[PDB]
């Protein structure tokens, strides 16, 4: 695309410098341009891609929430159309980043990935980016978006269950599916059963790990515990 004159490795190289500088718009466009070179990505290069687009959408989500609350406070004198126009503009920027990621996986990352850890990583991301769209959806397509996210989430679960151990951090990262249930799907008891089953089966697997791996998994198991303490 925009980055077509630059070598694949220089693009990886500059994504890591942007991270250091905290320049995540630059980081995301460098990694978009690497993806469009046509070759599969390694396990470190995949983490760069998710770190870059998460910090960018993370900022849009937070600003959309401020704006939408002012708009609703102005219902329960009136300042004009200005709040609803500006909230609409931000919202359209977020939907555009979500459509850009979703297009890179469809073209052609998911279909080329044959390893369990590649394929489960991309299918999670797909349910994450339909989720962020659902967070701001209100039309007829809102039930359709909730079902695309669901479907992508479930296919990744089935693979992870039969192909990886219960302490794998990509498998624990299932936390996100429980959030889907609680905050999007209006199914809070489903959300609670998943997080408790997930915590329990990892717990009974810790004895098999090194000190470095122990530390990685207990990180994510603590987030499952915080939510249960909040949802009860």
């Amino acid at each position: 695309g925009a980055m077509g004159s630059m070598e694949r490795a220089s693009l990886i190289q500059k994504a890591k410098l942007a991270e250091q500088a905290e320049r995540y718009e630059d980081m995301a466009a460098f990694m978009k341009g690497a993806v469009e070179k046509g070759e599969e990505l390694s396990c470190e290069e995949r983490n760069l891609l998710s770190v870059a687009y998460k910090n960018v959408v993370g900022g849009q989500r937070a600003a959309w929430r401020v704006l939408s609350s002012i708009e609703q406070k102005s219902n329960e004198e009136e300042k004009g159309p200005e709040v609803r126009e500006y909230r609409e503009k931000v919202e359209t920027e977020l939907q555009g980043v979500c459509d850009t990621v979703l297009g890179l996986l469809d073209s052609h990352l998911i279909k080329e990935a044959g390893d369990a850890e590649s394929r489960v990583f991309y299918l999670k991301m797909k349910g994450d980016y339909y989720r962020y769209l659902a967070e701001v959806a209100t039309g007829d397509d809102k039930k359709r978006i909730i079902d695309s996210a669901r479907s992508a989430y479930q296919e990744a679960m089935d693979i992870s269950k039969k192909e990886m151990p219960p302490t794998n951090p990509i498998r624990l990262g299932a936390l996100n599916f429980s959030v889907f249930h609680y905050e999007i799907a209006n199914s809070p008891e489903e959300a609670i059963s998943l997080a408790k089953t997930t915590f329990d089966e990892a717990m009974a697997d810790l004895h098999t790990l090194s000190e470095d791996s122990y530390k990685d998994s207990t990180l994510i198991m603590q987030l499952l515990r915080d939510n249960l303490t909040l949802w009860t």
Binding site: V51, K54, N55, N176, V179, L219, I220, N227, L230
Partner: peptide
């Protein structure tokens, strides 16, 4: 407040 989702890898 809202629920915790999975953190930025690094």
């Amino acid at each position: 407040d809202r629920s915790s989702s999975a953190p930025n890898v690094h």
